[PDB]
Design a protein around this ligand. Structure first.
Ligand SMILES: Cc1cc2c(cc1C)[n+](C(=O)C(C)C)c1c(=O)[nH]c(=O)nc-1n2C[C@H](O)[C@H](O)[C@H](O)COP(=O)([O-])OP(=O)(O)OC[C@H]1O[C@@H](n2cnc3c(N)ncnc32)[C@H](O)[C@@H]1O
Ligand SMILES: Cc1cc2c(cc1C)[n+](C(=O)C(C)C)c1c(=O)[nH]c(=O)nc-1n2C[C@H](O)[C@H](O)[C@H](O)COP(=O)([O-])OP(=O)(O)OC[C@H]1O[C@@H](n2cnc3c(N)ncnc32)[C@H](O)[C@@H]1O
Ligand SMILES: CC1=C(CCOP(=O)(O)OP(=O)(O)O)S/C(=C(\C)O)N1Cc1cnc(C)nc1N
Ligand SMILES: CC1=C(CCOP(=O)(O)OP(=O)(O)O)S/C(=C(\C)O)N1Cc1cnc(C)nc1N
Ligand SMILES: COC(=O)c1ccccc1S(=O)(=O)NC(=O)Nc1nccc(C)n1
Ligand SMILES: COC(=O)c1ccccc1S(=O)(=O)NC(=O)Nc1nccc(C)n1
Ligand SMILES: [Mg+2]
Ligand SMILES: [Mg+2]
Lengths: 582, 582
């Protein structure tokens, strides 16, 4: 590694911080300048290896960094000024923590002596973000910058990935020093309780339970994002069908015959059936969250549960397993795979009868949607995007009905094609996430499948897309409502509208707002599409027009995401029929 | 007060919460629905006295509630769902705390038993906001709703006003109960250390110091917002000149001859001169923040300091006064006024020589701006708005250069015409603040004087303006840069641009983005204006066109806010000359 400073040359803390990033391999940051971070931005222009993508709102910043991280496996870096800059990151940090996304957030802070005085643009950001980050730091000396940056990256990316925030006072940015890059990290506790390679004896037992089971199911989640090959081999050696969480989509190819697709509240009847009636649950890289389990006591109630997680705090948190492995699922699969190769003919594994039983459930209750006259079904639009992109696109989404449909109707072939806020479920995520995804993957088709409520929340990021010349495609499924909330109004509150309509009551049949004009404002080519017959050509135009593109897809608002298990319910409570019509 | 429920009739906690608001006199809320708050929104539609203004982002929500509060003297109410809804309020809460703005934020939360389980859309919002609110609450029983709401409003509006957050679990929203409205508040500590009416003996001493001084100065701030009459009478009885903080603008009419206008970093040379050379500083409702003092030891170094504040924690925090009054400045003025009436001829107060000395400083160093060819000076645009609105408009702003100019070049006649984020200095404030201001003041001229960086941050609120049919005028001073940061780049970093340009580098002479198309998207009439000659007619058109209007005012970017005292500097360090040209 070549520095831009002599080994004995003093330089600003800001310059040390930037080199610290270069030494971590950082190529991209998402930084919005302000008073308390000016020095860092000055240092950033001196770097020839890091590019800054300037967002139009620092919430746009974090969400972009998340998209970057989620689509690449690399940590996402965002920089903000003190005070209001720092507070604008808050939703992104919470989002990253809940979804286990590696992230380093650097915030400028007021000078050290101003801290606690209610200074200009001062927020106690470390205090504010303590419960919504994996860890955070207040840098109190320029000598500490190299160590803290190294620790921040190590913590964000190792174990269970998560966001780490580093707060950097302005006087420390300006202080001249000679950095020491040889310093030891001070993480004795964390480092000593890092998970070890799995024991053979643990892995042998799981393989034994597999051979003794007749109805096994893979319950796969976000923890498997780097194990697709290993998981592929595991399925190929066992023939166990695979159910996925929203976070796990694409770990096992959705278009494969062994795939049960997504389980949970809005999961497929067959995925949930499989789990309900399984005798062996293989929970790999999942956290048994309420969205997938429903009523805990009734979840997988007839099954031997094997749970493999890198975070011990998760093992036995909601359901207690029969068998646990605390470690990397990638290594557990690797170990199990060579045990399964060695004994393939000793084990004679055949789950054809179970696999067949599930196949009749897959035929009697497939994913389905109605088509009304010439009106566009959102589900069908996504299905066309799937066909026209050959399932190779990177998809980000907002939150709501459209998000569930993007999950249900696109066939992800690899993990890290699916970028979606799962745990927090933050609206306004898709557009800036697409931005980060596009920078991390400059040759990929990047589509933000968005809803009109979500899209508008961070619409300012359209400026970013244009200026950064990013080929972000926006498939806007426009139903004029907060669809998800509207659906619950239909099912549980007798269709009583409580502020869920996003159009103009004065001109209630006009599409409001005109999203095409938002795109026009930022010099982004855009079209509307209303008739289903016009759809295939509209999406083809979107894909073919080089650069960014917005396609406004008008959908009837009274569509419902199905199936649905009500909150805290059982598989028996599943709703498979109905909508908001008449 | 008439209820919509029988005195013995059980009803949902959500319905109790809404009635609790009606009983507090609440007429308007700013609420964005989500899963965890659906019940509250259902209850809200049942109310016939509260209107909900649906924002397009809940940051838009809080900022609107702030605008509402700041322009009316009433508390602002915003409602958000759990998780990402709650986190989106964070900047607004911090903003309200720092600027001492009364605010009640209600957030839905997950069911009580789900708390701490990493549930769907769960954030420990009480933990997150503890350091950025005056107080907060987690409601743990439906029986507590009446008490907590009463306490929240009492705390937000009494003493030093501030934001209070109430977190309300979903199961409590659904629980049936009979509310008890007679319950005693549990605030024994707070209530016992509430400031008392001022002592005569304290007030007599201040009047005595006034008579003994030859160079007195009023240093007036946000604490005087309800004391304009009292302050008017005080000045009329003493002839003491008045300097104002950014938060205090309009307490004493800016167009009066006794007015020194704004003091501080970007204050007038004469206001700062007055303070520098005063022998008696009358600090009423101010907090001696770094923006006005500079280097503390050099601030008002020759003066007897009288400090009147309602918060004891502020008295002697940064500068220690000679004399203190802990209490309401309104009452202190009332008391001092009748002492000044009784002894008017015994005191023979005449500060003409001092007042004259300041008047020559007011002539030798007035507020000034250059005009280049036919290009619009931002300062001049604001001055025209002042003339055409007769100084009667409610002005909200974003943060930066335009904010300082709006402060310097509009003559506020009453407090609560000036709505601006002072302590935190949060961008994207002006537009949603204007929204709240317009709802609180349906017959007033409401103008958001905004910058292009700030405006775009919450541009989605244009949808809100249209749908709510609010006559919000937007005077957008468009310099294509983050002007304030750009200015500091010119003065301190040799004009080295570190991500401060907001246009498109590919087409660098085109105005980007096209703000007119943002307005068009939301059906808001809009015009651009480039030549100074065209300005008076453009602004007249804006004012005359009924309903909302956006006027895009193009300004040369290299203008600088003057004067300027560098951070931690003295009156000697003041910069009165220069810009970013050549
Ligand atoms: C916004 C929204 C979200 C919905 C939703 C509706 C809406 C409107 N409905 C559904 C639904 O119907 N079905 C559904 O599935 N989700 C749904 N969700 C999302 C749900 O709240 C939650 O995000 C996921 O169910 C959780 O994904 P996970 O179980 O993969 O854990 P995830 O959050 O991905 O965490 C990964 C787990 O793996 C662990 N881990 C990380 N790395 C490793 C490693 N290398 N080796 C071993 N373990 C590791 C980590 O400790 C953690 O426990
Ligand atoms: C964003 C920005 C802001 C700038 C700025 C530049 C930018 C870009 N530069 C300047 C500048 O050059 N000059 C300037 O003045 N500001 C400037 N500011 C704002 C500055 O940071 C700060 O907001 C104000 O100086 C503080 O206003 P205050 O001193 O009136 O206290 P403020 O924050 O308004 O607080 C009011 C004080 O009065 C107290 N109080 C409340 N009610 C009462 C009552 N009824 N009776 C007795 N006391 C009460 C309360 O405890 C508090 O101490
Ligand atoms: C408004 C809303 C939703 C509607 C999203 O509106 P959209 O129009 O963008 O999407 P669609 O559902 O019509 O397809 S879903 C939801 C949940 C699951 O809490 N919320 C509440 C919510 C509110 N605010 C934020 C930041 N995030 C949220 N999830
Ligand atoms: C970008 C910026 C500023 C530029 C504002 O851009 P504008 O174009 O809106 O306003 P103008 O200055 O050109 O008239 S000022 C500032 C300060 C004083 O911290 N910041 C940093 C800042 C960054 N982000 C937020 C939310 N608030 C902030 N104050
Ligand atoms: C904004 O945080 C600060 O930088 C700060 C806060 C309180 C006191 C002193 C400072 S500073 O002197 O170190 N820097 C500063 O004030 N910067 C700054 N101040 C105003 C506008 C801009 C663009 N930058
Ligand atoms: C969203 O917070 C919750 O409401 C919640 C979180 C975890 C478990 C259970 C719940 S709930 O059952 O009480 N309500 C709920 O899930 N609501 C909800 N869930 C999804 C979409 C919508 C519009 N609403
Ligand atoms: Mg929608
Ligand atoms: Mg600007």
């Amino acid at each position: 590694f070549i520095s831009r400073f002599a080994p004995d040359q003093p330089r600003k803390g800001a310059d040390i911080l930037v080199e610290a990033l270069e030494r971590q391999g950082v190529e991209t940051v998402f930084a919005y300048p302000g008073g308390a971070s000016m020095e860092i931005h000055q240092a950033l222009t001196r770097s020839s290896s890091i590019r800054n993508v300037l967002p139009r709102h620092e919430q746009g910043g974090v969400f972009a960094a998340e998209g970057y991280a989620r689509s690449s496996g690399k940590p996402g870096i965002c920089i903000a000024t003190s005070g209001p800059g720092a507070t604008n990151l808050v939703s992104g940090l919470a989002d990253a923590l809940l979804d286990s996304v590696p992230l380093v957030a650097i915030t400028g802070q007021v000078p050290r002596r101003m801290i606690g005085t209610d200074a200009f643009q001062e927020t106690p950001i470390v205090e504010v973000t303590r419960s919504i980050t994996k860890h955070n730091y207040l840098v109190m000396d320029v000598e500490d910058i190299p160590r803290i940056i190294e620790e921040a990256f190590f913590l964000a990316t190792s174990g269970r990935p998560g966001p780490v925030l580093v707060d950097v006072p302005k006087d420390i940015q300006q202080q001249l020093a000679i950095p020491n890059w040889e310093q030891a990290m001070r993480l004795p506790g964390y480092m000593s309780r890092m998970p070890k390679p799995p024991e053979d004896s643990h892995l042998e037992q799981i393989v034994r339970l597999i051979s003794e089971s007749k109805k096994p199911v893979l319950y796969v989640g976000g923890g498997c994002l780097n194990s697709s090959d290993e998981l592929g081999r595991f399925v190929e050696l066992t023939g166990i069908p695979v159910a996925t969480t929203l976070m796990g989509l694409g770990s096992y190819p959705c278009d494969d015959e062994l795939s049960l697709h997504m389980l949970g509240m809005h999961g497929t009847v067959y995925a949930n059936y499989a789990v309900e009636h399984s005798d062996l649950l293989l929970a790999f890289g999942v956290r048994f969250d309420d969205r997938v389990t429903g009523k805990l006591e009734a979840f997988a109630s007839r099954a031997k549960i094997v749970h493999i997680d890198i975070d011990s705090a998760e093992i036995g948190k909601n359901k207690t397993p029969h068998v646990s492995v605390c470690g990397d699922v990638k290594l557990a699969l690797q170990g199990m795979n060579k045990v399964l190769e060695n004994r393939a003919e000793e084990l004679k594994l055949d789950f054809g009868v179970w696999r067949n039983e599930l196949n009749v459930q897959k035929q009697k209750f497939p994913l389905s949607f109605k088509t009304f006259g010439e009106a566009i079904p959102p589900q069908y639009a996504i299905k066309v995007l799937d066909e026209l992109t050959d399932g190779k696109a990177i998809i980000s989404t907002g939150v709501g009905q459209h998000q569930m449909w993007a999950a249900q109707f696109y066939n992800y072939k690899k993990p890290r094609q699916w970028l979606s806020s799962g745990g927090l479920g933050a609206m306004g995520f898709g557009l800036p996430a697409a931005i980060g995804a596009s920078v991390a993957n400059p040759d990929a088709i990047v589509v933000d499948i968005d809803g009109d409520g979500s899209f508008i929340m961070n619409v300012q990021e359209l400026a970013t897309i244009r200026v950064e010349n990013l080929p972000v495609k926006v498939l806007l499924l426009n139903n004029q409502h907060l669809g998800m909330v509207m659906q619950w109004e239909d099912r549980f509150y007798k269709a009583n509208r409580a502020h869920t309509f996003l159009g103009d009551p004065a001109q209630e049949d006009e599409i409001f707002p005109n999203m095409l004009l938002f795109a026009a404002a930022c010099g982004i080519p855009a079209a509307r599409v209303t008739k289903k017959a016009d759809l295939r050509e509209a999406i083809q135009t979107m894909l073919d027009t080089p650069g960014p593109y917005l396609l406004d897809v008008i959908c009837p608002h009274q569509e419902h995401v199905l199936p649905m298990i009500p909150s805290g319910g059982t598989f028996n409570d599943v709703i498979t029929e109905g909508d908001g019509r008449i």
